[PDB]
Amino acid sequence: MAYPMQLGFQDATSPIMEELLHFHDHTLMIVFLISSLVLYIISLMLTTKLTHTSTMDAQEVETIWTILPAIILILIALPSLRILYMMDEINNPSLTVKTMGHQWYWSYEYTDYEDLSFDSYMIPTSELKPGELRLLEVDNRVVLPMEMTIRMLVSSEDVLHSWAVPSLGLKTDAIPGRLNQTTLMSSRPGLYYGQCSEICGSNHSFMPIVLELVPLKYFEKWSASML
Amino acid sequence: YQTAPFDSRFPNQNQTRNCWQNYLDFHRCEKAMTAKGGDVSVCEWYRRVYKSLCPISWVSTWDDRRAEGTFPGKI
Amino acid sequence: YEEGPGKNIPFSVENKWRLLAMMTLFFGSGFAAPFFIVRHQLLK
Amino acid sequence: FENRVAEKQKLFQEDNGLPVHLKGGATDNILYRVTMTLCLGGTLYSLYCLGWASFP
Amino acid sequence: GARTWRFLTFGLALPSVALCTLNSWLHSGHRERPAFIPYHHLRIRTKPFSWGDGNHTFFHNPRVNPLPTGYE
Amino acid sequence: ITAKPAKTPTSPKEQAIGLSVTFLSFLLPAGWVLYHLDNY
Amino acid sequence: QTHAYHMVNPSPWPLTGALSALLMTSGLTMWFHFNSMTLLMIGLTTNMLTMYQWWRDVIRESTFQGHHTPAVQKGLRYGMILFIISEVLFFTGFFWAFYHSSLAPTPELGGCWPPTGIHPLNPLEVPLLNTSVLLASGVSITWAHHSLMEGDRKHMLQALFITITLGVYFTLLQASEYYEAPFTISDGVYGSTFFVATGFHGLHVIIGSTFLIVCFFRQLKFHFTSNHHFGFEAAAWYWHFVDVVWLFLYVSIYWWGS
Amino acid sequence: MFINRWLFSTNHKDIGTLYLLFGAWAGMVGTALSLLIRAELGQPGTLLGDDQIYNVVVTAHAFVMIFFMVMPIMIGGFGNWLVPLMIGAPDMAFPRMNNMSFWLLPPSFLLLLASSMVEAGAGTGWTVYPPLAGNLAHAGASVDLTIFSLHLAGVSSILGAINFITTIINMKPPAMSQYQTPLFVWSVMITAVLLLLSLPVLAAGITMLLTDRNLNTTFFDPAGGGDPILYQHLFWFFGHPEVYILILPGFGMISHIVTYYSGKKEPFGYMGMVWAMMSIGFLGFIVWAHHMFTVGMDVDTRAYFTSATMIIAIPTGVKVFSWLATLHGGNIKWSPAMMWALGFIFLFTVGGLTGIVLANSSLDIVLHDTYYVVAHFHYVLSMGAVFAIMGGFVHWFPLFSGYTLNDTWAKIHFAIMFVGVNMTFFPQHFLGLSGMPRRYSDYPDAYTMWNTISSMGSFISLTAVMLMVFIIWEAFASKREVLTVDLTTTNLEWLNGCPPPYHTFEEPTYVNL
Amino acid sequence: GGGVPTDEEQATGLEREVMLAARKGQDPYNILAPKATSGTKEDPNLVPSITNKRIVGCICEEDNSTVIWFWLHKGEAQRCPSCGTHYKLVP
Ligand code: HEA
Ligand code: HEA
Ligand SMILES: CCCCC/C=C\C/C=C/C/C=C\C/C=C\CCCC(=O)O[C@H](COC(=O)CCCCCCCCCCCCCCCCC)COP(=O)(O)OCCN
Ligand SMILES: CCCCCC/C=C\CCCCCCCCCC(=O)O[C@H](COC(=O)CCCCCCCCCCCCCCC)COP(=O)(O)OC[C@@H](O)CO
Ligand SMILES: CCCCCC/C=C\CCCCCCCCCC(=O)O[C@H](COC(=O)CCCCCCCCCCCCCCC)COP(=O)(O)OC[C@@H](O)CO
Ligand SMILES: CCCCCCCCCCO[C@@H]1O[C@H](CO)[C@@H](O[C@H]2O[C@H](CO)[C@@H](O)[C@H](O)[C@H]2O)[C@H](O)[C@H]1O
Ligand SMILES: CCCCCCCCCCO[C@@H]1O[C@H](CO)[C@@H](O[C@H]2O[C@H](CO)[C@@H](O)[C@H](O)[C@H]2O)[C@H](O)[C@H]1O
Ligand SMILES: CCCCCCCCCCO[C@@H]1O[C@H](CO)[C@@H](O[C@H]2O[C@H](CO)[C@@H](O)[C@H](O)[C@H]2O)[C@H](O)[C@H]1O
Ligand SMILES: C[C@H](CCC(=O)O)[C@H]1CC[C@H]2[C@@H]3[C@H](O)C[C@@H]4C[C@H](O)CC[C@]4(C)[C@H]3C[C@H](O)[C@]12C
Ligand code: CUA
Ligand code: NA
Ligand SMILES: [Zn+2]
């Protein structure tokens, strides 16, 4: 989850989120450099009483102005597209879980073996237990096995929603009549939080996502206990 | 069987047709087997795949429509 | 039609205090409207 | 039919200061007044209809 | 020239219309309406229509357009 | 740009009145609504 | 003035047009939600009054007052071309909707096109007749144009009358096919795409036929010269646009989509 | 006389004046909506109500700022005032149709304010996505009133585009080629081409939404074989060009302001600037699905949209560097208009660069539907489009009015607005990276500090808007009449005096070959 | 088969004035670009006007994008302030 005064991304929980952090660092260095160079050049143009107001020849300088930006964009595009295709690669999941968006809560279906399904609602502020997070806790967490490739399938039974978990690098739109796929792999046990990421009406702010990542043996026993 | 494997017919984020095709394949197979009086157990792979991938409400709606005579797929 | 400064506009600038009143009502009504719409929606 | 364009050119170029929408004569004034009355009256009715629809 | 485009109008274009008019005239006559099946992707009603009883399409033909509940 | 002196000069006092009236025309109606939100 | 451009007399029709737009939209709202046609009928009436007086005044300014210099005429040519481009892009949206739905038919349809329970019209029956009718009208309007340029009043009138008669034939055939169609606008995305796309096309055929009828009466009254007749050129361009949209509908919806 | 002049106008200047008045009023509505947004978010908890009233305010904020403030001021106001004067034309090609483009906007605005007053409003976002915008999740008149508002604004701008293209092509001096027209005139012609092609596609999409809501069509309804994602394609096919429509006239005004206050006769690299604007206009039609990177499209599609979107940085960079090269060697006049333009060059660059971050589909997975997007577009709109508008307004006010502003007050106004917009939007980057979603009335506690600071920023911007009204009053109150304007040899719009007569160029300019 | 009027028979107002002037090789409504002289003080560009001043735009060199604009007044020839080309008003 986010913490107070946070400047950057939530710490990476998945290898792909680690990849996105290093790609963001590379891109942000470029943004900082170009921003800085433009501000510096403005300030240089504006700090001399020397003048030259006659017609100036453009073509030489326009070569630099186009080639250097083209090279910089290629230097962004190359690692950008490496990561795009890495997320798309075939992985062989061990488990498929479905989530259905609703106004205003998520349902989960684990139907590889048994008919396990349940609803997941925000804990109201007045019912938080001491230490619990306003607007982020749910009654029924999405328990999942750590260190395993999981196929998440996302849809909706009403309006658009979007299923997001920032620390895993995940955001998949929940569209009625459509089954969208993403893959989830947590490097760590723990609790990983997200929030509905498509405007869906009165309680869009209040339908969060909580993943609970535990060893396979614990996930199997939880699964059995939820039937 | 753990879950539905990768299927090169459906390699993209949109998995709608994967659920649909496996649901059709199961019910086509079940009809073929019940008709000659053969064994629906040969249809098991399609059953496991559609149950893994398909939302419960899609299967429930499709089952209701087959019973009503309003299912629009060819079985 | 009248031409020149203060004449090529649909409002009078002959009196700066009448103009202040007209500008107050004009910009003030635009700024007020959303607050009164929110009030309307809350009062249903 | 006969070509009466010359007679309409004389009417519409008459030096009487009328704008082109009124220059055909009294019938233009009537059709203008009907149009503007329906527009302004219809606009007041649309405002009444918003007033009505703004409350349950 | 005008002469050529009149030649095309009367020599090619209107003969084509006359032939297609004959074609349509011969293949006309009411085809038999199919068995009503209450398919959920057809006879959509999310809001009543703003005319009639709310349940009839604008150019409703009783012979070939069933209601959600079947033929009238 | 060059320009003539003001045909109708706006003194500091007159500017303080115009600025005050302008600010109040924005602040009083919004203020009235936001103050009364609980009542609504 | 020592330029060739038209300084237009101050006019009320822009305001009456803008208000007719308010009355038509608020009218449709009042019809869809508050069970009443009154605002809508006022807006349709003021819209027709506005169009009538505005275009009447354009005829006064041009035929009667001589304001349409070659420079003004060139401007109107560009205006009508740009207007037609905007109408092409409007239809593109409906063609995009049609291809989107038909190339990737969803499970609710049976996963096929046409959908389960849809019995398309035979494209070789009335739809082919309609194609012959609009293509024929493209030939007759060309005859009308050449007759006008050659100074032939009688043949211009006969060709333009033939063109209007075909436009009317198409409209009556389409009305009958709407009535006879076993599917409706409420028959899923098939009915949606079919009736909205062919319906906007039908509206454009009625607009184009009305424009040609305006040209027919102006011709009866001798307004057009053998060299100056932009209203006729504009109506002919509009009419070719209507023909070409039909050919795209015929190939896409009626033939390929059957 | 008053009715004939102001309701029945066929005059490009008076119609321009009507657009500037309309846009200024719209800006006050849009500002009030922006303050309600930031009042809701300025402390954790609920101020107004749930997300419905909140998203009605957000939706209306966007429609008012885009359709009633920026487009009317840039295109209707500056375009009508300046384009005829910059080409020596006696008016627009279609001076009566011009008046209808203006008079469609009050009714458009009335339909939007009616949407917010009836039922529970249209809490849809300015994108109006179904099914939330459909007749089940938004039953009743609000969304239909929003659709009709867009229809009237769309017709206004389509007819206005036909008028500008025709005027700019057909009504220049016969010796003047397109490569002898000022950059602002190019910026309006290109913007008009974008409007002509994009708005009809929006019209088709929102018409389909209207028929799904009222005639039982199912374009966007899976139950009939429709697809909510088709609406998104039709909307964004318009919506990406729309943002280039919002900035292009601002690029044209920036070229004129930087040239003028650098003491130059001409912008650096004129043909490069024309090339850059035409390239941006073209590329702006082939990138729309960068608004859809999370909807589930194929990887190769995402790769194409990433790459095509990044290409826009090349022509855009040529413009930024050309502005810097215009300043180079200038006799710099530190006018208020110059300060707006210099703030534009820098702040637009920052927002352009955060756009390039977002163009990367892989990273956009995490940034999409977060405040990082909100930071990007407010740098380019509230510090780009708005800075160009304020620069153009203070530069050309004396042309339009015949009176001068108080330059010291205008510099104070710039300084307050600069602090307020940066305090508002810079922290929203942090909120986006750390995962705060868009269209939320309330946020988890961790996001409190940056939302608090952002809301305080919005109040500083309000103080700037109030001061601007006073500054315009003080100019009309004092009546300092313009005497001389420098650089008329390369700024034709000033050569008929301040204000110019009702009829200008009755006798056209003499330009020989 | 006739019966369609010609412009010669039926053109009126400004359209007719433009039509009749073009037959005489004349351009009172400024439809054509005027052709430059050498632009010396002996051979100035002659600028017609119906008043005592007119705006000149000077494209000083072929394919310049920058047009130089100034008022030309009745009386002694004036010079383009960029290239020095001479212009003389002929009211
Ligand atoms: C004026 C308005 C405006 C402008 C001009 C832009 C310009 C750009 N925008 Fe933006 N954008 C918006 C308004 C605008 N945008 C809005 C309103 C939304 C949200 C819509 C919604 O959901 O409501 C948005 C959303 C949006 C998204 C979707 C993000 C999401 O929803 O997840 C993306 C994705 O690529 C995008 C990218 C860009 C890019 C690449 C540019 C480029 O044109 C920027 C190019 C400029 C530069 C790069 C700077 C100058 C260049 C240089 C100094 C040269 C050197 C640079 C390099 C080598 C990189 N913007
Ligand atoms: C031009 C477009 C534009 C402008 C200028 C702004 C300006 C502002 N915007 Fe907004 N905004 C949007 C377009 C714009 N916005 C859009 C498209 C969205 C997305 C909506 C959606 O999600 O569906 C949005 C969303 C948005 C959000 C996110 C809401 C959410 O996701 O829940 C927030 C949050 O702070 C915000 C705040 C502000 C603030 C505080 C300003 C302030 O900077 C405003 C300050 C005031 C001004 C800048 C003055 C304006 C007036 C003039 C310039 C008049 C000039 C007068 C004359 C020339 C005479 N806006
Ligand atoms: C021969 C063809 C001529 C068409 C004339 C018919 C009716 C009126 C006007 C039509 C205008 C065209 C398109 C509007 C949308 C829908 C109508 C489509 C064509 C049509 O007429 O469709 C009919 C349905 O009409 C219906 O719902 C009728 C609904 C009537 C209300 C129309 C709602 C108007 C929509 C708003 C227009 C927006 C415009 C956008 C402007 C863009 C600006 C930027 C089909 O009948 P059916 O019984 O379903 O099936 C036949 C079964 N036997
Ligand atoms: C039942 C349906 C209701 C919906 C409303 C629409 C219904 C009907 C509209 C039919 C359009 C009729 C237009 C008539 C225009 C007549 C004026 C005219 O044609 O004017 C001509 C100029 O053209 C010009 O302005 C060209 C003017 C061109 C306008 C063409 C407009 C097409 C209109 C489409 C409008 C709505 C479409 C939107 C659909 C979503 C005048 O110049 P000339 O002809 O050279 O004459 C001069 C010579 O005599 C000199 O010797
Ligand atoms: C749900 C319902 C919503 C619908 C909203 C309806 C909106 C408004 C109501 C329309 C009222 C129309 C009244 C007639 C307007 C005629 C305009 C016209 O014909 O304009 C002409 C120029 O446009 C030209 O040519 C070429 C262009 C002619 C355009 C004709 C009008 C089009 C109206 C709708 C267009 C929408 C576009 C459809 C594509 C999306 C003439 O220009 P003027 O400046 O007059 O004269 C110049 C003089 O020199 C002439 O002698
Ligand atoms: C020249 C300026 C313009 C003139 C403006 C004229 C305004 C007067 C219109 C009359 O008002 C009508 O009142 C009816 C009520 O008597 C309504 O009937 C409708 O509403 C009724 C409500 O009882 C229902 O019977 C039905 O929905 C339906 O008949 C109808 O909506 C409404 O128009
Ligand atoms: C986002 C834009 C808004 C920014 C903030 C606005 C700044 C506030 C301006 C003052 O507004 C006023 O504040 C008063 C309180 O200070 C209110 O009086 C209220 O409170 C008084 C003191 O309790 C009572 O005497 C009055 O009767 C009562 O109406 C009054 O109505 C309201 O107009
Ligand atoms: C120049 C201004 C002077 C005249 C003022 C205008 C007067 C118009 C009043 C007529 O009101 C109508 O009444 C009908 C009957 O009450 C309504 O039909 C409604 O009710 C009918 C059944 O009664 C249904 O069949 C229709 O579908 C339905 O729209 C119709 O909507 C409504 O317009
Ligand atoms: C007799 C009359 C002469 C017109 C004239 O020159 O003034 C003729 C010339 C062309 C005739 C029209 C054309 O021949 C085409 C049509 C032929 C139909 O048989 C009658 C109506 C019809 C529309 C005719 C009406 C009328 O008789 C017209 C207009
Ligand atoms: Cu569910 Cu937002
Ligand atoms: Na809040
Ligand atoms: Zn020169």
The token pair that represents G11 in the structure block: 């006019």
Q: How many structural domains does chain B have?
A: 1
How far is the first Cα of chain E from the last one, in angstroms, to the nearest whole number? Answer: 57
Query: Is residue H151 a known part of a binding site?
Result: no
Cα distance between residue G220 and residue G215, in whole Å: 9
Strands A105-110 and A95-102: antiparallel
CATH number at C35 reads 4.10.49.10
The token pair that represents I86 in the structure block: 């001479």
The DSSP element (H or E) to which H228 belongs, if any, is helix H228-261
Per-residue b/e over G92-121, b at no fewer than 16 CB within 10 Å?
bbbbbbbebbbebbbbbbbbebbbbbbebb
The DSSP element (H or E) to which H510 belongs, if any, is strand H510-511
Phi, psi (deg, nearest 5) at residue D19: -70, 155
How far is the first Cα of chain I from the last one, in angstroms, to the nearest whole number? Answer: 49
Cα torsion A8, A10, A16, A20 to 10°: value is -10
User: In this structure, are A35 and A113 located in the same domain?
Assistant: no
Q: Is H369 left (phi over 0), alpha (psi -120 to 50) or beta?
A: left
Phi, psi (deg, nearest 5) at residue A138: -120, 160
Residues near H387 by beta carbon (within 8 Å), at least 6 away in sequence: H250, H340, H341, H343, H344, H347, H348
Number of Cβ atoms within 10 Å of the Cβ of H1: 8
E19, E27, E45: residue with CB nearest G125:
E27
Closest Cα partner for H429 from B63, E49, A7, A19?
A7
Asked if I35 and H513 count as a contact pair (C-beta separation under 8 A), the reply is yes
Strands A116-120 and I68-73: unpaired
Ligand 1, atom nearest to H62 Cα: 23
The token pair that represents B63 in the structure block: 């089952």
CATH ID of G1-67, from 3.40.50.1100, 3.40.50.300, 1.10.287.70, 3.40.50.2300: 1.10.287.70
User: In chain D, whose CA is at the least distance from the CA of C37?
Assistant: D54
Q: Is H71 left (phi over 0), alpha (psi -120 to 50) or beta?
A: alpha
Selecting among H156, H279, H335, H454, the annotated active-site residue is H156
Q: Order of strands across the sheet with I68-73?
A: H510-511, I53-58, I68-73
Closest Cα partner for H40 from H31, H26, H51?
H51
Confirm or reject: Cβ of F37 under 6 Å from ligand 7: no
Cα distance between residue H368 and residue I43, in whole Å: 68
Residue from H55, H386, H413, H429 to probe ligand 2 pocket by mutation (most atoms less than 8 Å from CB)? H386
Q: Does G109 touch chain B (CB under 8 A)?
A: yes
The token pair that represents B59 in the structure block: 């299967």
Phi, psi (deg, nearest 5) at residue H8: -115, 25
Cα distance between residue G95 and residue G200, in whole Å: 12
DSSP string over G131-153: HHHHHHHHHHHHHHHHHHHTTBH
| Inter-chain Cβ pairs, chain A and chain G, closer than 8 A | 3
Boundary residue ending a domain (A60, A91, A122): A91
Cα torsion H222, H228, H233, H236 to 10°: value is 170
Asked if H462 and H31 count as a contact pair (C-beta separation under 8 A), the reply is yes
Closest Cα partner for G201 from G244, G154, G158, G233?
G244
Per-residue b/e over A39-70, b at no fewer than 16 CB within 10 Å?
eebbeebeeeeeeeeeeeebeebbeebbeebe
Asked if H120 and H98 count as a contact pair (C-beta separation under 8 A), the reply is no
Number of Cβ atoms within 10 Å of the Cβ of A18: 14
Tell me the residue type at A194.
Answer: G
Closest Cα partner for E21 from H50, G96, G172, H162?
G172
Kindly provide the resolution of this structure in angstroms, with one decimal.
Answer: 1.8
The token pair that represents H15 in the structure block: 């119609």
- Can you tell me which residue has the tokens 């009062």? C43
Cα distance between residue H142 and residue H382, in whole Å: 27
E70/chain H closest Cα distance in angstroms: 18
The DSSP element (H or E) to which A181 belongs, if any, is strand A180-184
Asked if H5 and H14 count as a contact pair (C-beta separation under 8 A), the reply is yes
Contact (CB<8Å) G3/H170: no
Cα distance between residue G248 and residue G193, in whole Å: 14
Residues near H279 by beta carbon (within 8 Å), at least 6 away in sequence: H314, H315
CATH number at E25 reads 4.10.95.10
The number of residues making up chain A comes to: 227
The DSSP element (H or E) to which F12 belongs, if any, is helix F12-35
The number of residues making up chain D comes to: 56
- Can you tell me which residue has the tokens 């915008």? H133
CATH number at B22 reads 1.10.10.140
Asked if H437 and A209 count as a contact pair (C-beta separation under 8 A), the reply is no
Residue H500: CA atoms inside 13 Å, Cβ hemisphere, count?
25
Asked if A10 and A1 count as a contact pair (C-beta separation under 8 A), the reply is yes
G38 C-alpha to center of ligand 6: Å? 7
Q: Does H212 touch chain E (CB under 8 A)?
A: yes
Is I72 in a helix, a strand, or coil?
Answer: strand
Residues near C35 by beta carbon (within 8 Å), at least 6 away in sequence: F29, F30, F33, F34, H32, H36
Number of separate helices (H) and strands (E) present in chain G: 7, 0
Contact (CB<8Å) D1/G221: yes
Is I11 in a helix, a strand, or coil?
Answer: coil
Cα distance between residue H228 and residue H429, in whole Å: 30
Tell me the residue type at A122.
Answer: M
- Can you tell me which residue has the tokens 């074609």? E23
Q: Is D18 left (phi over 0), alpha (psi -120 to 50) or beta?
A: beta
Q: How many structural domains does chain F have?
A: 1
Confirm or reject: Cβ of G206 under 6 Å from ligand 4: yes
Instruction: Tell whether the torsion through CA atoms of H372, H376, H381 and H382 is positive or negative.
Output: positive
- Can you tell me which residue has the tokens 């016969």? H174
Asked if H432 and H373 count as a contact pair (C-beta separation under 8 A), the reply is yes
Q: Order of strands across the sheet with A180-184?
A: A116-120, A105-110, A95-102, A150-156, A180-184
Cα distance between residue D10 and residue G201, in whole Å: 41
User: In this structure, are A158 and A127 located in the same domain?
Assistant: yes
DSSP string over H311-370: HTHHHHHHHHHHHHHHHTT------HHHHHHHHHHHHHHHHHHHHHHHH-HHHHHHHTTB
Q: Is H507 a catalytic residue?
A: no
Tell me the residue type at I50.
Answer: I
**Host domain of residue C39:** 1-44
Asked if H191 and H245 count as a contact pair (C-beta separation under 8 A), the reply is yes
Question: What determination technique applies here?
Answer: X-ray
Q: Does G100 touch chain B (CB under 8 A)?
A: no
Burial of G73 (0-12, 13-18, 19+ CB in 10 A): middle
Asked if A69 and H320 count as a contact pair (C-beta separation under 8 A), the reply is no
Nearest CA to ligand 2 atom 23: H125
Distances (CA, A) of D40 to C5, D21, G19, G54, H389: 32, 18, 8, 18, 34
Question: How far is C-alpha H483 from the chain's CA centre?
Answer: 32
Cα distance between residue H505 and residue H507, in whole Å: 5
Burial of I3 (0-12, 13-18, 19+ CB in 10 A): middle
- Can you tell me which residue has the tokens 């601007």? H468
Cα distance between residue H293 and residue H270, in whole Å: 36
Spell out the domains of chain H, with CATH numbers in brackets: 2-513 (1.20.210.10)
Rounded to 10°, the helix G126-149/G230-249 angle is 160
User: In this structure, are A78 and A127 located in the same domain?
Assistant: no
Tell me the residue type at H230.
Answer: L
Nearest 5°: the CA angle B63, B65, B69 is 125
Q: How many structural domains does chain D have?
A: 1
CATH number at F7 reads 4.10.81.10
Strands I45-48 and H510-511: unpaired
Residue from G82, G210, G216 to probe ligand 4 pocket by mutation (most atoms less than 8 Å from CB)? G210
**HEC readout, chain D:** CCCCHHHHHHHHHCCCCCCHHHCCCHHHHHHHHHHHHHHHHHHHHHHHHHHHHCCC
The token pair that represents H34 in the structure block: 């922006």
Cα distance between residue H504 and residue H271, in whole Å: 29
**Host domain of residue A184:** 92-227
Tell me the residue type at E28.
Answer: S
Beta bridge partners of I47: I89
Residues near H230 by beta carbon (within 8 Å), at least 6 away in sequence: G96, G97, G100, G101, H219, H220
- Can you tell me which residue has the tokens 């710039």? H414
CATH class of G68-258: mainly alpha
Strands A208-214 and H510-511: unpaired
CATH number at D24 reads 4.10.91.10
Q: Who surrounds ion ligand 12 at CB < 5 A?
A: I 58, 60, 68, 80, 82-83, 85
Cα distance between residue G153 and residue D2, in whole Å: 12
Closest Cα partner for G196 from E44, E49, H215?
H215
Q: How many structural domains does chain E have?
A: 1
The DSSP element (H or E) to which I40 belongs, if any, is none
Cα distance between residue H467 and residue H411, in whole Å: 11
Task: Detail the DSSP E strand segments found in H86-223.
Answer: none
The token pair that represents F17 in the structure block: 């009145």
Query: Is residue I35 a known part of a binding site?
Result: no
Q: How many structural domains does chain C have?
A: 1
Asked if H195 and H243 count as a contact pair (C-beta separation under 8 A), the reply is no
Asked if H107 and H152 count as a contact pair (C-beta separation under 8 A), the reply is yes
Q: Where in chain G is the domain with CATH 1.10.287.70?
A: 1-67
Confirm or reject: Cβ of G59 under 6 Å from ligand 4: yes
**Host domain of residue E72:** 1-72
CATH number at A31 reads 1.10.287.90
- What letter does residue H138 receive in the DSSP assignment? T
Burial of H153 (0-12, 13-18, 19+ CB in 10 A): buried
Cα distance between residue A156 and residue D38, in whole Å: 48
- Can you tell me which residue has the tokens 């044209």? H252
Number of Cβ atoms within 10 Å of the Cβ of E62: 10
Cα distance between residue H422 and residue H351, in whole Å: 12
Spell out the domains of chain I, with CATH numbers in brackets: 1-91 (2.60.11.10)
Cα distance between residue G68 and residue A65, in whole Å: 48
Closest Cα partner for G41 from G26, G51, G60?
G26
Distances (CA, A) of H170 to H84, H193, I62, I64: 11, 15, 21, 21
